Amino acid sequence: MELSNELKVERIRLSLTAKSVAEEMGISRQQLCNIEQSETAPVVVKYIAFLRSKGVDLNALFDRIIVNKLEHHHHHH
Amino acid sequence: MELSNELKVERIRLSLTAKSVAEEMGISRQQLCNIEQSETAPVVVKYIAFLRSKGVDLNALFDRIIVNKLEHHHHHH
Numbered sequence: 001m002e003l004s005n006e007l008k009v010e011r012i013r014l015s016l017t018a019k020s021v022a023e024e025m026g027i028s029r030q031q032l033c034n035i036e037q038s039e040t041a042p043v044v045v046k047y048i049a050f051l052r053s054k055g056v057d058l059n060a061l062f063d064r065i066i067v068n069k070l071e072h073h074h075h076h077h
Numbered sequence: 078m079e080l081s082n083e084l085k086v087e088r089i090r091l092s093l094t095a096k097s098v099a100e101e102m103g104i105s106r107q108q109l110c111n112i113e114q115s116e117t118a119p120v121v122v123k124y125i126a127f128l129r130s131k132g133v134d135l136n137a138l139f140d141r142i143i144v145n146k147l148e149h150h151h152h153h154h
Contacts, residue, residue, distance in 0.1 A: 001141065001142070006138055010133050025123055025127065036124075041121055043109075044118070045121065046102060048122075050098065051087045056091070
């Protein structure tokens with residue numbers, strides 16, 4: 001299925017604009033084109049899947065990086 | 078809790094060795110050290126996070142790559 005081929009399909013389905021992505025991403029538009037043509041993803045992405053495969057809260061990890069971090073829900077766990 | 082700081086927490090929390098991870102990952106131990114010395118997250122990962130922000134089933138995409146193509150779907154959407 002090729003990862004690059006699936007990336008374009010989702011982009012087309014969401015018909016998103018690189019203008020908004022580059023402004024929000026904070027990178028040059030030319031680099032955005034290179035990300036999809038970046039041949040393959042770095043071992044970093046595979047490394048994350050390894051920890052995720054162990055049930056590691058990957059979503060919570062990325063949630064903390066993006067602003068609007070979760071506050072106190074008053075619930076222990 | 079920076080990108081490398083949390084990366085150390087999951088490794089320490091699950092206590093994973095470089096040799097065990099490198100053999101399971103299928104990469105050289107030197108490549109694993111490169112990830113630890115990596116600088117912040119790459120634009121490739123940030124671009125992918127953008128697709129997830131759109132509600133894209135990113136997890137299902139990787140699940141499809143691993144193990145035979147699992148689908149057995151014949152029910153209504």
